[PDB]
Amino acid sequence: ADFFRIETEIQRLDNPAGILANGKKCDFTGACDPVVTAFLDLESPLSPWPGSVAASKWKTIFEATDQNSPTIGRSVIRDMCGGSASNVNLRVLVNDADEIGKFSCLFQLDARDVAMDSLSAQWGPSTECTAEAQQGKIRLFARRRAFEIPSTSCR
Ligand SMILES: [Mn+2]
Ligand SMILES: [Mn+2]
């Protein structure tokens, strides 16, 4: 499988205390205003956060006002073209619209994981991402799928 697509879904953020990574409240009369930026790290997945590419260069995928624990439902897509990758890491930053949490959902990419095609690429299990701070207090969940694509479709 020398040409394949990785899609990772940031499923949901849970912040019952409505706090920041520094542990104070996002909003003292309201809830967090979470802004989600993310990036699927193929080149330095086993390195410390942020990995290969700096957070400030990531695309904004989800936004919300006064929802500590929003459902997200949004994908980050990456393609491995012309060779093999053994894992990938969905690096996520969450800010209060100010750091809520830096997360890392590392994902194996063994042969098991990359389906022969898109229709046969079932989502894998929901996985909790690793946070820099507030482990278990501010949680982020995400799942992966991967499937072979034709080379002319690989970005
Ligand atoms: Mn797709
Ligand atoms: Mn707010």
Residue numbers in the entry: 66 to 162, 169 to 226
What do the authors of the reporting publication say about this deposited model?
Here, we show that a novel Mn-dependent peroxidase is an important factor in tardigrade anhydrobiosis. We crystallized the putative globular domain that lacked the N-terminus 62 amino acids of g12777 protein (g12777-Δ62) and solved the crystal structures as two forms containing Mn2+ or Zn2+ ions at 2.30 Å and 1.60 Å resolutions, respectively. The functional assays conducted here suggest that g12777 is a manganese-dependent peroxidase, independent of other components of the cell.
